[PDB]
Ligand binder design. Sequence first.
Ligand SMILES: CCN(CCC(=O)O)C(=O)c1cccs1
Lengths: 257, 300
Amino acid sequence: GAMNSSNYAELFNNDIKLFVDDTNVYRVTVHKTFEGNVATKAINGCIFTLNPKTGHLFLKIIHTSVWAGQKRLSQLAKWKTAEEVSALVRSLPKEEQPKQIIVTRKAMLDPLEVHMLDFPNIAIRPTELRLPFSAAMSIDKLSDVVMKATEPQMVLFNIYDDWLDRISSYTAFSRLTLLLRALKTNEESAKMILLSDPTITIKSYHLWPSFTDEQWITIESQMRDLILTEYGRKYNVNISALTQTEIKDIILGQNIK
Amino acid sequence: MNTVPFTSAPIEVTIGIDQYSFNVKENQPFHGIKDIPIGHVHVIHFQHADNSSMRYGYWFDCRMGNFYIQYDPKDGLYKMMEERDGAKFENIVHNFKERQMMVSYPKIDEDDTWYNLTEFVQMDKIRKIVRKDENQFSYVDSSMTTVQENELSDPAHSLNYTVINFKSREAIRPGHEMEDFLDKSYYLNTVMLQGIFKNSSNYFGELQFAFLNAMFFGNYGSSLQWHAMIELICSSATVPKHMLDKLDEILYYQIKTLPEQYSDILLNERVWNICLYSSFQKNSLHNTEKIMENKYPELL
Ligand SMILES: CCN(CCC(=O)O)C(=O)c1cccs1
């Protein structure tokens, strides 16, 4: 059925699965024209296709050329997403093909089902999780490869860097969703938390800084502080007054539809 | 001037003949139905007074043979049988008519309702949907499942409607996924009309037969098929003008005949709202839109 809180551990079992997030496929700037009408200008986008067990990210860059002379772009973007996910699955060896594809937005279900008719044993599922994968473009190295692209390109990343050497997939995904939620909620404050101590760098082959286990605990705390601070600012709530249950419930509640 | 005599009526029953119905008492001197109009298929249907779950009937055409009804006390139903002895059959019918023990098919001269509901329905197409090749007439009941329903059990007692599935390789050409899913014209015109039905008359005959089995038996699979065949047309950008105009006539008479008190079980809100207000054909069904808005505005 739907992937929710009740079946969360299923994400980290040994059944290959992919999340697909289409929220950055069709991206525009909105501007006034000379005549004072409004026009859009597309910018390069990306499909975010992630294995939550291994951290493997299949970032398909969507170059603005794919929109040229097309209509109903927000509808087309879903079908282009499904077309590219189905092309990625066909490109993978059989033993690497997912058993399940979890779409972050339920508007992706019909397009993906229809493109995947040839794979009746791959389950296409929605999720009750509110995942912050839209914030992928707040990761500097991801934003940079998308914006520099001059043509359609697939780029492969491990979005966990080397964390799985030290932590479980469950913990790695929890860390990723906390970082992306913080970057979604207050990008500048999240980047300052990550990039403050100049002595801790990002390896050439990594996306995130080289924090020790103790430093990751500090960073994670600072990210939860940011999220709670922003929830207080948004709703005009005195957060200093909140209890530990109230706080856990607020940070969790935001990653649940 | 064709007749379906009954041997007797041992159990109290509501008898339908096409859109008509009448109540027969247990052991009433009832011996059948005369003055059945030649040139159309007919349906004679039953709902037992003591058990409304017993809801079943027979599609027949009096041009194909001499049919009668006899109650079977073992299987507990009114069975259609064919009498091969023409002179015996004529003599039985003559005796019952002389004694006035038959009801007359109550057709009003001005009234084209039954022709309008069966225009495309032919007994040979019925006999391919309902497979019992030893009889010239076809048994249908409330509980018979469709070949589609059976996929998602007894294959000998099934309704062999054409399978329509919008999310199937049959409906969707590799490489034309968005095109074919949003515009069902390929699936309607190439696969269904050119490929399976051969022409719009056969397609409309199956649609009309599905509606009639839905209405007369409360056959749920038949209702699903009727709506699927409407949606397939309404969801196609490219449909011949003659087919759209004919569909509007077909659906108008169906909505006209539907009992108000069954509108809540026989009409699918999603399909009708989609077909009349959202689809490619939202403005092609003027007569159907007007009767739906005037008769069933709560559904819309
Ligand atoms: C922060 C960890 N986390 C919340 C956000 C996330 O990881 O999806 C969870 O353990 C759960 C999510 C839904 C039910 S439990």
